């Protein structure tokens, strides 16, 4: 079977998704799922809706996890001729770190390490941290008042080289090197549909 995906908003194995795009990246903290559902409407019978705006999903790609984190939005469209589509979007579980606002009481970490300041800037929204780089010590860590849970981390992992992104399980990976795991030797003339 060519079958790659099987999405679960909670257990409901999507069988109507008319299209899909799943993006993962190291340049950022999250990903971006984008499903397209049909959602018919018969204007006499009863109809049911799903107002998820937050109901959690995953995308098992080719019998293996690819994403983990319809939180993004619901975008029910309309038209006369090809209408009644529903674009669902779903960022990564490491999102509230992106759209929140730090609410730690003190604001002044003293004699701490970047790992610790990152553990307390995350465990306010239950995002287990996959620390796999090192422990750097720093005397003064004052967080700008309510800056953003993601700006502060990015600042604290850029002045000591540490890539900050998200894995397939739903965790925050703060690494310093690679994920190992070598693979296919793409050769020109063998599988590249296109290159640039």
């Amino acid at each position: 079977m060519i079958k790659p995906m099987r999405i679960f908003i909670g257990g409901e194995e999507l069988v109507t998704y008319t299209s899909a795009q799943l993006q993962r990246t190291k340049k950022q903290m999250t990903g971006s799922l984008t499903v397209e559902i049909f959602l018919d409407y018969v204007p006499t019978k009863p109809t049911i809706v799903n107002a998820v705006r937050g109901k959690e999903i995953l995308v098992y790609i080719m019998g293996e996890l690819a994403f983990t984190g319809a939180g993004g939005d619901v975008s029910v469209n309309f038209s006369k001729g090809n209408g009644y589509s529903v674009t669902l979007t779903a960022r990564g579980r490491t999102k509230y770190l992106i759209d929140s606002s730090q609410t730690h009481p003190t604001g002044f970490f003293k004699n701490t390490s970047d790992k610790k300041v990152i553990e307390t800037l995350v465990k306010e929204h239950n995002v287990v941290l996959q620390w796999d780089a090192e422990e750097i010590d720093e005397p003064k860590v004052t967080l700008r008042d309510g800056n953003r849970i993601y700006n502060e981390i990015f600042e604290r992992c850029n002045q000591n080289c540490h890539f900050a992104y998200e894995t397939r399980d739903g965790k925050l990976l703060i690494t310093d090197g690679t994920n190992g795991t070598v693979g296919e030797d793409i050769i020109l003339g063998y599988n590249i549909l296109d290159f640039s």
Binding site: I9, V15, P46, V86, G189
Partner: protein, 394 residues
């Protein structure tokens, strides 16, 4: 043929109840996929993506003194809201929706006849919503754990039992938590990350304290979280022996009387039911090697659950937990039976005489590298497997 009766072989066409006479009958079947054309390469790929939507095209005629009224009635029917049932003259009954109907009708060139060119599309029903299929490949352990929480907190209150038994009851609770701790410490093993290093410290900080288990809330939270951490430490077979030991530990009964015995028995029942549920979840995470093996595992778990239900029904202790256990038992039944019979569709091939592993694999599948797959299910020397060989469907 020479004696081909057409109107005794073509079905009289009709749409949505209204019948008419058709002049043509077409179809637009197909199979849509991609087409890969790797650069600089003498090779090409293809990927089957699904089913091309069917469409039918007809031509109806009206040659009658009242063809105008018939065409008006047919127009009024074709413009009805929603798809309806169509009798294609050569494909029988389908569900289609009209998409265009041109009505040619001339006067000074051909009066008397009216032609209609019709264009239908296979319109299958839907299920409003997100057409969300079920999940019958997986167990949901949330309802049974909530019911266990209820039945535990109902019969456990070390503040409402006789004073010469509270220390005994609480020591039994701490002993249960110690068992879960030992289970985790034996299942993790070579887990070096600091997450273990903390979980161990959390277990010790909970066990050393004295007033922690005197409250039903803390005791239940510790128990559920301990089982969840024990679950998340390994995958599948690794968690078998450990969990089965736990089922044996809590297979005892309390000698205290009245309320004290009820509290200790609540401890034991919570442990046994949580162990049965998590052992079911462990069985489901691994593939069945033989139908009899999957069915034997299901037999074990269903027996444990029925034993617990009989216990929770003996003299109307709690009717509610009995019903909850019964429901979880039927759920584990559906999932374990589907796993044993249908996860890989195991068939018994009948070979004439015993044969090698490579030859058997190549003849069944057309791929001899799959010989490794024929060893986990069949017993018999690698050079003589059979003459009946269990394997997967093709």
């Amino acid at each position: 043929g020479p004696c081909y009766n057409p109107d005794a072989e073509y079905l009289p066409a009709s749409f949505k109840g209204f019948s008419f006479d058709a002049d043509s009958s077409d179809s637009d079947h197909g199979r849509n996929g991609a087409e890969a054309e790797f650069v600089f390469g003498e090779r090409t790929g293809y990927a089957d993506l699904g089913i091309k939507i069917k469409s039918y095209q007809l031509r109806a005629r009206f040659q009658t003194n009242d063809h105008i009224a018939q065409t008006n009635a047919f127009i009024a029917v074709l413009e009805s809201p929603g798809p309806g049932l169509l009798v294609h003259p050569t494909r029988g009954t389908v569900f289609a929706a009209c998409r265009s109907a041109r009505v040619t009708d001339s006067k000074v060139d051909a009066a008397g006849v009216t032609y209609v060119e019709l264009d239908f599309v296979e319109a299958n029903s839907v299920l409003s919503g997100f057409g969300l299929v079920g999940n019958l490949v997986a167990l949901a352990l949330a309802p049974i754990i909530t019911a266990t929480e209820g039945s535990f907190k109902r019969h456990f209150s070390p503040d409402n039992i006789r004073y010469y038994n509270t220390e005994a009851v609480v020591s039994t609770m701490a002993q249960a938590v110690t068992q879960v701790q030992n289970a985790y410490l034996a299942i993790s093993g070579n887990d070096t990350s600091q997450d273990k290093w903390t979980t161990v410290r959390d277990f010790r900080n909970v066990l050393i304290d004295e007033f922690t288990f005197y409250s039903p809330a803390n005791a239940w939270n510790v128990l559920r979280n301990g089982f969840a951490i024990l679950d998340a430490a390994a995958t599948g077979s690794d968690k078998f022996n450990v969990l089965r030991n736990l089922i044996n530990w809590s297979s005892t009964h309390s000698d205290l009387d009245g309320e004290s015995g009820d509290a200790e028995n609540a401890i034991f029942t919570a442990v046994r039911v949580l162990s049965a549920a998590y052992l079911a979840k462990a069985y489901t995470e691994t593939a069945a090697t033989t139908v009899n093996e999957g069915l034997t595992q299901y037999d074990l778990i269903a027996a444990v659950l029925e034993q617990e239900a009989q216990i929770a029904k003996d003299d109307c202790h709690d009717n509610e937990f009995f019903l909850q256990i019964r429901a979880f038992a039927v759920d584990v039944a559906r999932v374990m039976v589907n796993r044993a019979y249908n996860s890989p569709s195991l068939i018994v091939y009948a070979f004439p005489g015993t044969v090698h592993g490579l030859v058997a694999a190549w003849e069944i599948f057309g791929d001899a590298k799959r010989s490794r797959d024929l060893e986990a299910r069949n017993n018999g020397s690698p050079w003589a497997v059979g003459p009946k060989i269990i394997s997967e469907r093709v």
